[PDB]
Design a protein around this ligand. Structure first.
Ligand SMILES: Nc1ncnc2c1ncn2[C@@H]1O[C@H](COP(=O)(O)OP(=O)(O)OP(=O)(O)O)[C@@H](O)[C@H]1O
Ligand SMILES: [Mg+2]
Length: 215
């Protein structure tokens, strides 16, 4: 069976007695596919990922998934530790690390530190820009050997050309055979996705292919 993620008629609430944050959501992702998730602010995109990760329990419907998840938060975060430690976690693969550094354009940033990627981040440490933090957080999520990659608006703070270059080098190329969900608004990104889910006010506006969306 190639099917990796199934959501069936999911409705969910963050608050008991509140308004549902997701209403009758459906999608299916096969192994290696890219699902783009789009929609305006507050539409429920991050909430959808929280359902997949088990942080938000459905009040009806089913989320079917078994496997390791790697999550890139839309609020990019840094741990105390070196740049290399922030990215690699528990399993060292030098070739994979170099490929992720390259695809996230981190070589130029690292090259400017005397300690290179052994520079130690933390309280009293150097200050990283929003865009440097986003690319380190993306590197960490993409480096992990996982079964499903949940990339929640990972290009924060990047200018338009950098976002295009990294969407191509990381999400399209480096991760070409990985099962991926990307929260993104750019029509250029949706055009490359295998499936698209557009949310509006917690409901499914559209679920289909880009050609189906153009129609
Ligand atoms: N952990 C949480 N606890 C309670 N409410 C939450 C939580 N996370 C999100 N919400 C709420 O759920 C609704 C949907 O927001 P969500 O963050 O899923 O939207 P989004 O589509 O990810 O928005 P954005 O594009 O701004 O990131 C909002 O009303 C928000 O306040
Ligand atoms: Mg969000």
């Amino acid at each position: 069976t190639t099917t990796e993620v199934v959501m069936e008629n999911v409705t969910a609430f963050w608050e008991e007695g509140g308004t549902p944050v997701l209403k009758d959501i459906n999608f299916k992702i096969e192994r290696g596919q890219l699902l783009a998730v789009a929609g305006s602010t507050g539409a429920g995109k991050t909430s959808l990922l929280m359902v997949i990760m088990g942080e938000l329990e459905p009040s009806e419907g089913k989320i079917k998934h078994s496997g390791r998840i790697s999550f890139c938060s839309q609020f990019s975060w840094i741990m105390p530790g070196t740049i290399k430690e922030n990215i690699i976690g528990d399993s060292y693969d030098e070739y994979r690390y170099r490929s992720v550094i390259k695809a996230c354009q981190l070589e130029e940033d690292i090259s400017k530190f005397a300690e290179k990627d052994n520079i130690v981040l933390g309280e009293g440490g150097i200050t990283l820009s929003g865009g440097q933090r986003a690319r380190i957080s993306l590197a960490r999520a993409v480096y992990k050997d996982a079964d499903l990659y949940l990339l929640d608006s990972p290009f924060g703070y990047l200018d338009v050309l950098t976002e295009k270059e990294i969407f191509e080098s990381c999400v399209c190329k480096l991760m070409a055979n990985k099962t991926r969900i990307l929260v993104t608004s750019k029509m250029e990104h949706l055009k490359k996705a295998d499936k698209i889910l557009i949310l509006h006010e917690g409901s499914s506006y559209f679920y289909g292919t880009f050609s189906e969306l153009q129609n």
